[PDB]
Design a protein around this nucleic acid. Structure first.
Length: 112
RNA sequence: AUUGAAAGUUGUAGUAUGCGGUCCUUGCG
């Protein structure tokens, strides 16, 4: 039971897309607006990330779907990055690059 | 049968010139 709290036509469109049938590219749009409420048996329609993972075939499957959706915007991200680097160089700013020692999370407490 | 009868405070004329809602601050234990 993946009933959505959105008007019926967008509800069925989101249902169609959610089962890896379409190629919606804005990951934020999928996550924020068309939220897949899950009503697993013997329980009300919860909305936690655990239920969302239960909707997908496996945790790896959900991770792959998210990675694909994120990677789908590569060209736009590249153009934006070129503009950003041009801005950095234009203002005469020192730029460097590091890497994450371990896992990172910023703004975990943002309310959703 | 009177210091009386008579006479448009009226014409033109831009509340206008200058000015950054800005500074400080980890969404987190």
């Amino acid at each position: 039971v993946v009933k959505y709290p959105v008007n019926s036509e967008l509800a069925n469109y989101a249902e169609k897309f959610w089962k890896k049938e379409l190629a919606i590219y804005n990951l934020s749009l999928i996550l924020n607006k068309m939220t897949p409420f899950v009503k697993r048996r013997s329980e009300s329609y919860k909305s936690s990330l655990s239920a969302v993972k239960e909707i997908f075939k496996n945790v790896d499957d959900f991770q792959n779907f998210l990675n694909s959706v994120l990677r789908r915007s590569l060209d736009e991200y590249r153009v934006f990055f070129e503009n950003y680097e041009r801005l950095f160089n234009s203002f005469s700013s020192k730029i460097f690059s590091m890497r994450t020692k371990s896992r990172l999370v910023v703004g975990l407490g943002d309310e959703s």
